[PDB]
Symmetry: C2
């Protein structure tokens, strides 16, 4: 039974029980673990998170794009409750189980990779990115990996290296994994300053990136190009059409592994099962996590078999990876997406969000850009009439929204992107109410 | 919760038909690099048994590589998970926090061998937790280098692969690796004895040799941290001579270097103490935990002195899933189970049984060169008779024979010649003795 599907302010935010927990957190948990919301969760589902003080908050974050099928989705709940009674863990590398194999089979069926495929399962998106890189290096016997401006790939030493922004992800945590290189990205809103055409000519932006890659790395030294189809933490940046196709074509001609990092965009989030579908991109490897298992810790790499099978037996794995409870949850998640038509639901949500935010942009020129696909939509805030970022306004907006019982996140290289990641279980009325709150706060 | 029948049972050949069908599916769906030890597919597990799809019931002497210490599907863990999942599966602690995360951190702070004011942070895997302990140490010290030891195992990410000593299969072809990672010599009494019997058990002098390497080849003013397992796990259940860890700790404290105890495998009752640092009264600066922490659910942690832990800036630590609320509920239940079922004492009982059985076997069979470990982390090292030459061939044959007779048993070691025993603390004496009987019978044959 989920919380009542209405916003409710029982107390000030934070309320007293949340504040008590904030004080406990401060004396038990390292300060490096930051928290966005000043409330403590007790129950969640549909479009709501209910806190320890009885407030019900509208969820426009889905736990950073994780609870796409909704928190405590009925199929996930049942799958976890059943499996936990059978076994919690055998370690797949010790005693295997059907759940792991079935999830790999489903990934192989569902992903935009073409031909014969194999998969492997881990826990976090960072681990899965690490394994995609291991796999590419093993297959190609080449060292280098290139990632892009505004990219985010995780918090391990190598995924920090792959990540572009230092504060807070990398600052003081190096030195970082070697032979990682940076290439320029298609970012239409900011590329427009140098030519309206370059803001829309994705093939040309890819050629700029290729020249960097060719000259500064060389295909014969390059294992892999890793890219998010839409940059997530970097600001919900959607590349100009032609950028991803041209990159993939270059990789295919130069024996370089094209790795799509769909940790955030994957599993119905962008109004397709995978965001690579929007331009018909068939990557060599695809990394998945977040929405894959309805909140349970699971991640994966799926890819062309000949690439995936290069690592030697026992060269991939980890103790917990592909946990049987998580696998049960992932199968339940897939079944939920397919049975409830959640890809189409993300499309419906895109229409509502782009309509509402577009009308807002029309009334407020501090909104420089509205962008994204499906239920991954954002607005970038700027000093009116310019592309100068306004992170101060972004912080103010988010703080005001939180005070009014709405969970909303920011992101961006310049800290000035307000993003929207509602779960696909949110109803239209709560989605529209959340956006109403943002409008009211922005007006004041 | 209803665990499988607590008896070994061979319903079919190993593998049976249903397992063979699954082996065939695995081969066409799963990357070959994900290896599997047992040729059987699990359906249910608990107590001291794993039951497979063909109805075979195998004796579990692996606990999923030291994870299901409290037993598979432990009653309190099952209850906690089932309760939590109905409330919420995930909010991201970094977005909307929840009490379970805080409560696990408070419990770690209370139970760990770190002294003074403490803080914790939660992740998913042991590799992630090691990575975090390193990030924390670097942030706090503003020094770059980290030293790990011969025979060390710390994980499968780029940096934890760097920290890990053995290349096959952990590192091979997966570099280049994270920079400013260095290697120092380890106390390994069995193999050190060839070079001096007295020296081999002098852990203080062993530490002094490692400190000389560290001083000369790195320098304290360039070194953020020393990371070490109290008993090396994948490297062979190597127990350092007494005085090694205390002397290393003392040097670190004198030289502003973070001493990181990697208790991913040794932690949470496994060694007959809550934490293995307790056996010599070591108080590390940071301690890494995972595996047994949450009864099989994916969770890991770093706990440490508050002034070190709080060095990273706000939002510098975390990850999307870390400290998942279902895993936190399982951790709280795991801790409660260890206390309520007296599992630390149970680990001590199992130590006695295993060391007595294996010591008798060693007296009768000169191919057993060494029997070592603590608690329910015990191993025997197999050698050519009369020597310390490793016998990986015998190890493999012994493990294969055991698997065919319905016993899950693992190997390890730098030279592939260590048979390890990691029974769950929920195993009955009779099944544990039966599992050991199987190993004996296979070894005789």
């Amino acid at each position: 039974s989920h919380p009542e599907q209405s916003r409710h302010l029982a107390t000030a935010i934070p309320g007293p029980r949340s504040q008590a927990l904030i004080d406990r957190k401060g004396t038990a948990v390292a300060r490096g673990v930051g928290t966005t919301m000043p409330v403590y969760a007790v129950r969640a589902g549909g479009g709501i998170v209910e806190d320890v003080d009885g407030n019900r908050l509208i969820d426009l974050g889905s736990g950073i794009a994780v609870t796409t099928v909704g928190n405590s989705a009925p199929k996930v709940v049942e799958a976890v409750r059943s499996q936990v009674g059978d076994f919690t863990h055998t370690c797949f590398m010790v005693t295997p189980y059907e759940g792991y194999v079935a999830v790999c089979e489903q990934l192989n069926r569902l992903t935009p990779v073409r031909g014969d495929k194999r998969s492997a399962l881990f826990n976090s998106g960072s681990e899965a990115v690490e394994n995609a890189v291991k796999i590419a290096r093993s297959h190609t016997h080449k060292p280098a990996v290139v990632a892009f401006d505004h990219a985010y790939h995780g918090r391990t030493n190598l995924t920090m290296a792959l990540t572009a922004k230092v504060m807070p992800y990398k600052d003081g945590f190096g030195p970082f994994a070697p032979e990682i290189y940076r290439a320029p990205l298609s970012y239409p809103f900011r590329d427009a300053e140098f030519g309206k055409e370059l803001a829309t000519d994705g093939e040309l932006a890819a050629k700029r990136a290729i020249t960097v890659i060719d000259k500064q790395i060389g295909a014969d030294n390059l294992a892999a190009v890793v890219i998010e189809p839409i940059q997530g933490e970097g600001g919900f940046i959607v590349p100009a059409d032609g950028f991803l196709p041209t990159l993939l074509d270059w990789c295919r001609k130069n024996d370089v592994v094209f790795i799509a990092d769909e940790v955030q965009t994957g599993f119905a989030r962008t109004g397709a099962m995978f965001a690579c579908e929007h331009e018909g991109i068939d990557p060599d490897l695809i990394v998945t996590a977040k929405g894959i298992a309805g909140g349970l810790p699971l991640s994966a790499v799926t890819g062309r078999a000949e690439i995936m099978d290069s690592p030697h037996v026992s060269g991939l794995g980890g103790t917990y990876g592909g946990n049987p409870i998580a696998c049960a949850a992932a199968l339940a998640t897939i079944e939920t997406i397919e049975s409830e038509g959640l890809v189409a639901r993300a499309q419906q949500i895109e229409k509502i969000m782009k309509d509402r935010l577009g009308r807002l942009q029309a009334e407020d020129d501090r909104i420089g850009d509205v962008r994204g696909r499906g239920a991954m939509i954002a607005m970038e805030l700027v000093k009116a009439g310019t592309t100068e970022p306004d992170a101060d306004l972004t912080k103010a907006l988010c703080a005001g929204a939180h005070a009014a019982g709405v969970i909303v996140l920011s992101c961006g290289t310049y800290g000035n992107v307000v993003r929207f990641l509602p779960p696909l279980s949110i109803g239209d009325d709560l989605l529209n109410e959340g956006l109403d709150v943002l409008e009211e706060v922005l007006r004041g």
